[PDB]
Amino acid sequence: GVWDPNWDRREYKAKATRHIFLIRHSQYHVDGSLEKDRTLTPLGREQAELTGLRLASLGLKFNKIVHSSMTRAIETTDIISRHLPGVCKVSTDLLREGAPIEPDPPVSHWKPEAVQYYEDGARIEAAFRNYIHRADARQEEDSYEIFICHANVIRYIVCRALQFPPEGWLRLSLNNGSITHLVIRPNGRVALRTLGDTGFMPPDKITRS
Amino acid sequence: GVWDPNWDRREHYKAKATRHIFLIRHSQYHVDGSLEKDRTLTPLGREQAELTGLRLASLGLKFNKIVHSSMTRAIETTDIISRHLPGVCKVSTDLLREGAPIEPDPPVSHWKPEAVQYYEDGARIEAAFRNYIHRADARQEEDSYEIFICHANVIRYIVCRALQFPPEGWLRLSLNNGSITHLVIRPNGRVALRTLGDTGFMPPDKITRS
Amino acid sequence: GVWDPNWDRREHYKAKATRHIFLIRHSQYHVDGSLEKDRTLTPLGREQAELTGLRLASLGLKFNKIVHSSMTRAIETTDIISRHLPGVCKVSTDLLREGAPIEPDPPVSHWKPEAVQYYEDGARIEAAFRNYIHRADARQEEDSYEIFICHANVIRYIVCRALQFPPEGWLRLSLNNGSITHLVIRPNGRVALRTLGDTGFMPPDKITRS
Amino acid sequence: GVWDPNWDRREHYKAKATRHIFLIRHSQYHVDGSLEKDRTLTPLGREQAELTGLRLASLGLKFNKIVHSSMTRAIETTDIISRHLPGVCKVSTDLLREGAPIEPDPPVSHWKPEAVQYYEDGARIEAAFRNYIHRADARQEEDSYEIFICHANVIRYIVCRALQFPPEGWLRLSLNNGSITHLVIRPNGRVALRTLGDTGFMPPDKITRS
Amino acid sequence: GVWDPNWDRREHYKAKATRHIFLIRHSQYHVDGSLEKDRTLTPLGREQAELTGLRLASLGLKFNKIVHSSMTRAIETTDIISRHLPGVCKVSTDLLREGAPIEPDPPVSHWKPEAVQYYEDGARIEAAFRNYIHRADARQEEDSYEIFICHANVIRYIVCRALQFPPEGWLRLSLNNGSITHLVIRPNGRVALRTLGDTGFMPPDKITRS
Amino acid sequence: GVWDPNWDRREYKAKATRHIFLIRHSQYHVDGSLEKDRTLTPLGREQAELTGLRLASLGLKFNKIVHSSMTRAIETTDIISRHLPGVCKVSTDLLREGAPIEPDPPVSHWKPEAVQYYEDGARIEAAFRNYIHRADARQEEDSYEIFICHANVIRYIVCRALQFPPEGWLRLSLNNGSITHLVIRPNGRVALRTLGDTGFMPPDKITRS
Amino acid sequence: GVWDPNWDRREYKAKATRHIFLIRHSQYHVDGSLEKDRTLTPLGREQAELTGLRLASLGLKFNKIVHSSMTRAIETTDIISRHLPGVCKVSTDLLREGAPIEPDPPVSHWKPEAVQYYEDGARIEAAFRNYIHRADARQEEDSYEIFICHANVIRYIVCRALQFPPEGWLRLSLNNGSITHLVIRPNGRVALRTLGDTGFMPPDKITRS
Amino acid sequence: GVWDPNWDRREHYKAKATRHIFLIRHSQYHVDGSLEKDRTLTPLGREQAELTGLRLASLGLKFNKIVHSSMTRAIETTDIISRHLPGVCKVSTDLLREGAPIEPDPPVSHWKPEAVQYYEDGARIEAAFRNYIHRADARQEEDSYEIFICHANVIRYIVCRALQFPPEGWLRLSLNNGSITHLVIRPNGRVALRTLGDTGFMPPDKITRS
Amino acid sequence: GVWDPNWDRREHYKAKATRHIFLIRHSQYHVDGSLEKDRTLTPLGREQAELTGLRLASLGLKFNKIVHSSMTRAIETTDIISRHLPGVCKVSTDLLREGAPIEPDPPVSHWKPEAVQYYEDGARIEAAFRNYIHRADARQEEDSYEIFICHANVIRYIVCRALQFPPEGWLRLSLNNGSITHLVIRPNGRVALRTLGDTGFMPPDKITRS
């Protein structure tokens, strides 16, 4: 039940804090037939633009923008990339949407089958481990890193990062284009500083699908 | 100890199709290369991929896709093998990049990565295994022939996991550069390894492991 | 689960030599043949052994011996492979005749021999494994290259036992006719499988498994 | 402790035939002989095999086959015993060569081979036991009388295994040179030892154990 | 499972002497005989004891004593064997009379005595075993050669107990009429069976088991 | 702890009672060098004569006289046999003297070694089983049987017959020439009716060695 | 299960052995209406006379004759007292006949009820303790003591003295007028030297009721 | 803790009769007396027994028996009490002689007998309790009035046992010389103590406890 | 089971004095009397108290106090007993009134008060016990002789508690009318009952229990 301080790589000793900005994609055409048809809507593009504008206004030197290989995630990265010029980009399969694990409590509308929790769960857990950890000892400066992916992924990441039961990932909810801020101090401590932040979007332009 | 027949998704309709999977190690490459993009194939490397490509074309098979690691050596061998198999879908993947799958038994002196690597990479390679090695989808009508161009530790760990052998013994296998490794996955969920580290098609003077 | 390093004879002095072992399945043969002596190679069979022989000659290796099964199909492939490797000691063996090593897991419908076969043949194939697969004698100065021309179940059981994988999974492997399978046994007792069921040297139209 | 009645192949129909098995130790031989081919019978040795042969001929039995070890001393006694039993099939075997079957209990000072021998030879002698000692095939109509000309440790281990006594006690038995040992295997699977180390037919001045 | 070295009286001074024990089954006898004294040897019986006697005399051994069962068939064979070994102490015993030592495994249909017999006779035969089969007394200077003329079940149970094999398997052995069985008991407590059911000295036409 | 009614062969069903008369030998020359030197003394012969005379005076038709093969036991059987003419005799090794089992409580003067308890114990126990049991079902008449042997043997027989701890065999004591009477009813029940009886010997002629 | 060496009063230290002679009464009129009618028969008196004669012939200086207060026990003491003149006599209630404890194995003819085992058992056990023990430390000479009582009493005494299961008291049997000899060495060790001895009675004059 | 109603013989017919039991301690006596027969009553003693006797006669009861201890002081008081109750059966007993019933709690300094006494005497006094204190026999028609003339420890132990109080507390009671103690035993098995250590009938100048 | 030596106040200095306590039941009284004041002594009652009084005067003891129950029958007997003991302090008490102390074991049919009485009266009688029955105060130099004139259940419960017997057995005792009961309490805390229900001083025709 207690916090594990070696949830990755515990004590050179690390000096740097990593700020992690987990961003859900914007609105997209769900009905789209093939993956490449599932592109952002006109509203979607407006949302990513605001999200991009907000990150630019923070006055931070972002190191990289890592993103899911799904078309909706790429298209929001395309728009957010404009407001943050000359920032390294990296495509990832690990951050594609999936079914992380059986959510508790259960739900009627959404019950994927055991094979999905098996295949996707190992992938999302692998994403968590590779992207959420304390700094390398060889990192001199504090990093600010953007991760543009999907709802289940982010919510599972957040629960795992905080060492809450991962089963409760579906007790969280994230709007489209929403910024979620995790801090990872070099002693291994994690703090969630905002979740599902879309205070920067005019209320008429906030959605979850 | 016993074979698990629901190692993924056992009998919704039932699968009809067999998947042939061709796990191909990359060719020789400049290890000393400074950045990842400098770690390109050698002149010998290119010769090896050419032979591997030539061999796959000679099989008389209609390959559906070529999936490959995002590492530069894997891409460059895919570039050459792609020429002999024209008009075949290609897909880049991070999952299949080289890593340290898990603690190998018995241990070795030259190569001992630290626990964090087995943690981070192991979950990634295991995720790769699960997403690419399984029996057919029920909605697949025809038998597939699929190429996977990646790296040694990855392939050897895939093979051990596919066969349900202890994954710890992945380093008891060894694979030459440009080598074809054939797994069959019948729709009943059964796996058979049909050849491993095959480079019989390379002239002996052109066979390497680094 | 763990690797046993004294699976035979662990550190008279200490061994210096690596043994390369080349387990070769026989070529195509007339299965319908009435008596054992009728079960001879086919025209295709002879073509396969010729290629296998040609490939071994092209390796530029000084083979020490060719040990073979006493079954007619194994002898006949040894006859052809022996031509390309002139002046190499040959030795006939009963231990390496085909059999049913042990109950395979998972089971199969087409092939179910009865308990007495697993008992009689299993002890024979296990005896073959122990007598031929081990690390070098201490009195051997130079690295050996040894050919073993026998049969599918035998080889697959040898391979599983050599690698210390569950022997029950011998039928999860599959070996083509005339196929070269390479095991290395370093003098520290470590075993590595370097290729399995290699027939990259055969034109695709001439590859079979029966 | 209890007798296993399916120690091989228990109730294609059911067996009708009893197999009489005559395990014969070789005669005296030159132990000091440098190579295996030098280890030939002595003048006394030949006298012993002659008596053993004479005795088997006097039994009035139609022997089906004489199976023998491939060691020179075993062959040479088979050569002499073969004369008195004319027109009886002969078969050479590696399985029946002398070895160290398993760690004997209690231990002995004079004779302590090392673990690798018990491993390699034990599997071979056990394989010999299983392949030659079992109840009749169902397709055998008449009772067989079979001769097996081999070596002391082999026979004593066979006998202990046949009777289902602890095989560790093989060295608690002792067999003279040229000695006949009679096992019966009724078709119900029951084994009876009817004489062991019989050399009552040799004049006392011509009995040896080395 | 392991050999007990203090199965009697292990290292008072220490034993120096080996005891050779010659367990001899009686010859053929009239089973149908009404009273015990009617159960005398047949004409063949007498011929058998004569040969057995002749054989023991030909060994060139100075026998110390002849101990025998008090049953008439055992006495009558002792009478004939005593002639060829003149001036050798004789001693009658009840302990060595025939009985049912213990439940034999596996069971038999023809012969099933009831629990009271295994109780009464078993304690008697076990007492016989202990009193006659042990290592030498320390006060015995010379190696002994001792004859024990008794019955089949007795001998077979003695042999199993002497060798520390499961006594239940006494009926897995079988002994001819007039047959010599040789046990050696070295002064360190070690037992070796050197021949069992030896009747090689009888012409085949004169060998029986009842 | 409770009486076992199948201490041999329990329920044709038996009809006959067996009376068993366990008789210790008379005085003998203990110092005698070889077994054949250990013969009865002049007093010994007097004792056996009285014992014999007493058994003849009982007016019983004795079926057999079984005896130990030791010289002192034979010699007393020779004298007792005279007073009971035409009664079957049988020699036995089972009834020779020995050390039946470790006696409790222990004693200082007499401590034989483990090998004796092993070899002799199995023999005396075998004697007990073969001679002490209920009648055969095929026995029509009540038997009266004499057993001429030795002290340790008899005392061990008695303890075993009564189902008392056999360890207490040395808590009993038996005079030379002494009659000991066991009854074995056909239902398997045993009764000791006299032990170490030498009331028939003049007091000046009673010994235990 | 093992012998208890402090079955009474274990280690001045005792020097003396006590010989104890437990004697059953002679034949008596069982049918007698009142206790005083249950007197010895003409045969009874003959038996006590022989028993008395035998004890006198032992050449022992008896210290006391203790006896049961039942009329048959007194009457045999009267006759035995004649042959041992000037020997202290003592009457006792403790040694009257009773049912000591449930006998094993059971019997059909004789099954007294629980109250008897309760009342009599405590009395016979009290008799055992008061009369059967090792010598007092203050006793210089070896004693020879006579106890004239009844069958169940004696048989229970004997079983308890020897430390055998007392339940087996009915596995013993004692003739009328029979001498039973217990020895109690000063180290606390007990030996039974004869039981139910009537070798001194002509066979035609031996009874058990 | 609870009253046991079958402390002897509970409901064969059922008891109808109540037993009154009058436990009387002896009078004063010469303790210093050398032998038991010297320990006779004093002149005061005789006066006490006379009063006790006089009191029992004045009760107007038909006493059935007077049972008494065999000690001389108990007999001598019975002699005097017997005069006032003419023609009443008398019976001597060893059971009721004085002793040490069991370890008294709490302990005392002046009087500590040793374990052997509690063993020997305790079983005797307990036997006395059981034989004399119980409910009526069914065959007793009339209510009995019974006198028991004995000693202090005996009576006090009887009383504690009769009432089912801890017998260890027997020394918490105290009884004067010549004192009457009355127990009633109704035929349902119930016990009542009606007076204890009653000497109200003695002039105070004539009351003692030794 | 064991005696508690600190049943009150165990070793201000240490106690020197013994307390004699004389628990006296009231005399006969009119039970049928309507109100408590009607329940006065009978003519016989007065005769009884007179004798009890006369007896206490004859003891030659200097009584310190007479404590009594406030019930009319207890007062009236105190009135008569007070005459024979002139100038002795008197004290009335509610604690010593009659009640139901606790459930008696064994139970009775005639008398079954209900749980509330055992609750209310039990606490009162127990309080009486504690306040009046204990060892002397340390400040008391001389031995006391104290009279307590009360009722049957009270006294019997006091006695059981004083002796540390199960209080449940209070009804196993019985006390006559006018009866003296003597408890001694030595300064070490030890209690002895020296007589109970003593009415030896009353002519038999004048003894009652109601």
Numbering used by the authors:
A (entry chain C), F (entry chain C), G (entry chain C): 56 to 66, 92 to 289
B (entry chain B), C (entry chain A), D (entry chain A), E (entry chain B), H (entry chain B), I (entry chain A): 56 to 66, 91 to 289
Authors' text:
PGAM5 is a mitochondrial membrane protein that functions as an atypical Ser/Thr phosphatase and is a regulator of oxidative stress response, necroptosis, and autophagy. Phosphoglycerate mutase family member 5 (PGAM5) is a mitochondrial membrane protein that belongs to the phosphoglycerate mutase (PGAM) branch of the histidine acid phosphatase superfamily, known also as two-histidine phosphatase (2H-phosphatase). Despite harboring a canonical RHGE catalytic motif, PGAM5 lacks a typical phosphotransferase and/or phosphohydrolase activity for small metabolites, and displays instead a phosphatase function specific for Ser/Thr and, potentially, histidine residues (Takeda et al., 2009, Panda et al., 2016). Overall, the catalytic domain of PGAM5 adopted a classical phosphoglycerate mutase-like fold with the canonical three-layer sandwich topology, which featured a six-stranded β sheet flanked on both sides by α helices with the first four parallel strands arranged in an alternated β/α manner.
To provide structural insights into the role of the N terminus, we next determined the structure of the longer ΔN54-PGAM5 in complex with a phosphate ion. In all three molecules in the asymmetric unit, although most parts of the N-terminal extension to the catalytic domain (amino acids 67–90) was disordered, clear electron density allowed a confident assignment of the WDPNWD motif within the N-terminal region, which packed along the surface of the catalytic core. The accommodation of the WDPNWD motif required both intra- and interdimeric contacts where the tryptophan residues of this motif were accommodated in two hydrophobic grooves, located at intermolecular interfaces created by two different PGAM5 subunits. The presence of the WDPNWD motif triggered a simultaneous occurrence of two interesting structural features that were not observed in the short ΔN90-PGAM5 structures, including the now ordered proline-rich β3-α3 loop and the newly formed interdimeric interactions resulting in a dodecameric assembly. Within the asymmetric unit, one subunit of the dimer associated with the subunit of an adjacent dimer with their α3 helices paired in a reverse manner at the dimer-dimer interface. The WDPNWD-containing N terminus was then positioned in proximity to the proline-rich β3-α3 catalytic loop, leading to an alternated arrangement that resulted in the β3-α3 catalytic loop of one molecule being sandwiched between two neighboring N termini, one from the subunit within the dimer and the other from the protomer of the adjacent dimer. This configuration promoted most likely an ordering of the loop that in turn completed the active site architecture, a feature not observed in the ΔN90-PGAM5 structure. Based on the dimer-dimer arrangement, an application of the crystallographic symmetry led to a single-layer, doughnut-like dodecameric assembly with an outer dimension of 138 × 48 Å and a radius of 65 Å for the inner hole.
